[PDB]
Design an enzyme around this catalytic site. Sequence first.
Site, PDB file in Angstrom:
ATOM      1  N   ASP A   1     -12.395   9.568  -5.498  1.00 39.88           N
ATOM      2  CA  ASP A   1     -13.009  10.829  -6.037  1.00 39.88           C
ATOM      3  C   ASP A   1     -13.721  11.056  -5.801  1.00 39.88           C
ATOM      4  O   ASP A   1     -15.065  12.126  -5.902  1.00 39.88           O
ATOM      5  CB  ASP A   1     -13.279  10.094  -7.664  1.00 39.88           C
ATOM      6  CG  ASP A   1     -14.552   8.747  -7.039  1.00 39.88           C
ATOM      7  OD1 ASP A   1     -15.681   9.360  -7.926  1.00 39.88           O
ATOM      8  OD2 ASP A   1     -14.125   8.053  -6.070  1.00 39.88           O
ATOM      9  N   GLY A   2     -14.250  11.582  -3.950  1.00 39.11           N
ATOM     10  CA  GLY A   2     -15.558  11.834  -3.431  1.00 39.11           C
ATOM     11  C   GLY A   2     -16.464  11.029  -3.444  1.00 39.11           C
ATOM     12  O   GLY A   2     -16.377   9.830  -3.465  1.00 39.11           O
TER      13      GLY A   2
ATOM     14  N   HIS B   1     -16.985  -7.891  -3.384  1.00 41.44           N
ATOM     15  CA  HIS B   1     -16.648  -7.632  -3.906  1.00 41.44           C
ATOM     16  C   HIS B   1     -14.896  -7.564  -4.486  1.00 41.44           C
ATOM     17  O   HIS B   1     -13.889  -7.998  -5.178  1.00 41.44           O
ATOM     18  CB  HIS B   1     -17.113  -6.550  -5.018  1.00 41.44           C
ATOM     19  CG  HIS B   1     -16.862  -6.439  -6.525  1.00 41.44           C
ATOM     20  ND1 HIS B   1     -17.207  -6.836  -7.291  1.00 41.44           N
ATOM     21  CD2 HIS B   1     -15.511  -5.392  -6.334  1.00 41.44           C
ATOM     22  CE1 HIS B   1     -16.793  -6.115  -8.740  1.00 41.44           C
ATOM     23  NE2 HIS B   1     -15.715  -5.293  -7.871  1.00 41.44           N
ATOM     24  N   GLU B   2     -14.322  -6.756  -3.097  1.00 43.54           N
ATOM     25  CA  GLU B   2     -12.804  -5.978  -3.140  1.00 43.54           C
ATOM     26  C   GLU B   2     -12.168  -7.501  -2.552  1.00 43.54           C
ATOM     27  O   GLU B   2     -11.421  -7.443  -3.005  1.00 43.54           O
ATOM     28  CB  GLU B   2     -13.002  -5.043  -2.064  1.00 43.54           C
ATOM     29  CG  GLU B   2     -13.821  -3.519  -2.454  1.00 43.54           C
ATOM     30  CD  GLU B   2     -13.707  -3.253  -3.897  1.00 43.54           C
ATOM     31  OE1 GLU B   2     -12.319  -4.031  -4.680  1.00 43.54           O
ATOM     32  OE2 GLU B   2     -14.411  -3.039  -4.784  1.00 43.54           O
TER      33      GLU B   2
ATOM     34  N   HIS C   1     -11.545  -9.461  -5.039  1.00 42.77           N
ATOM     35  CA  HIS C   1     -10.310  -9.266  -5.921  1.00 42.77           C
ATOM     36  C   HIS C   1      -9.316  -9.411  -4.794  1.00 42.77           C
ATOM     37  O   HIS C   1      -8.096  -9.906  -6.191  1.00 42.77           O
ATOM     38  CB  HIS C   1      -9.898  -7.518  -6.010  1.00 42.77           C
ATOM     39  CG  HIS C   1     -10.546  -6.858  -7.608  1.00 42.77           C
ATOM     40  ND1 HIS C   1     -10.439  -7.673  -9.035  1.00 42.77           N
ATOM     41  CD2 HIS C   1     -11.952  -6.239  -7.591  1.00 42.77           C
ATOM     42  CE1 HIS C   1     -11.730  -6.963  -9.358  1.00 42.77           C
ATOM     43  NE2 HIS C   1     -12.375  -5.868  -8.555  1.00 42.77           N
TER      44      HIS C   1
ATOM     45  N   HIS D   1     -12.575  -8.753 -12.687  1.00 39.52           N
ATOM     46  CA  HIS D   1     -14.142  -8.724 -13.038  1.00 39.52           C
ATOM     47  C   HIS D   1     -14.854  -9.756 -14.476  1.00 39.52           C
ATOM     48  O   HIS D   1     -13.771  -9.960 -15.039  1.00 39.52           O
ATOM     49  CB  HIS D   1     -14.110  -7.473 -13.378  1.00 39.52           C
ATOM     50  CG  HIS D   1     -14.208  -6.214 -12.344  1.00 39.52           C
ATOM     51  ND1 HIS D   1     -13.984  -5.030 -12.683  1.00 39.52           N
ATOM     52  CD2 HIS D   1     -14.356  -6.810 -11.585  1.00 39.52           C
ATOM     53  CE1 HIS D   1     -14.654  -4.145 -11.736  1.00 39.52           C
ATOM     54  NE2 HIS D   1     -14.062  -5.139 -10.878  1.00 39.52           N
TER      55      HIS D   1
END
Length: 164
Positions: free
Chosen positions: A77-78, A121-122, A125, A131
């Site tokens: 998303d930038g 956190h990644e 996953h 979560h």
Amino acid sequence: GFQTFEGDLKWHHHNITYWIQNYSEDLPRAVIDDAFARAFALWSAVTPLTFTRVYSRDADIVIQFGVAEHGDGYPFDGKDGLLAHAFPPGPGIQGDAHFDDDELWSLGKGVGYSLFLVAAHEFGHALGLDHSSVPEALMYPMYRFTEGPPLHKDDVNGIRHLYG
Ligand SMILES: [Ca+2]
Ligand SMILES: [Ca+2]
Ligand SMILES: [Zn+2]
Ligand SMILES: [Zn+2]
């Protein structure tokens, strides 16, 4: 508390290999390598899984830095908003973790987002952890700079459930 994915997704072998596709110019090559190595190291202690750095595409976990549109058909998303995403364990895209480079990558200290901290956190996953309802968890949707060490019972209960 914690959550897992539909069908309880997990790696079905104990050697997990990661290939780092590319780097941000935000950090020196060595800091990035270390930040990631540390993120597996937190996971290494609590799991049967070991993490060996490899230099092949065939790797179980592939880490890349992308801006906006990139490989997986999921655009970043930038500045701000989404910083990183990952996919539950499996073939190809699964197990892979991407970091948005528009984000400033640092070791934190109020200068930005901690590369190790976003990575964990990644990586969580990537091992199949979803979560958490617990607001102090590593798997919580909210990122804050360390009141760490990062790991938590909820996160550790989550990993023990899947692997050991
Ligand atoms: Ca972003
Ligand atoms: Ca993969
Ligand atoms: Zn991606
Ligand atoms: Zn997440």
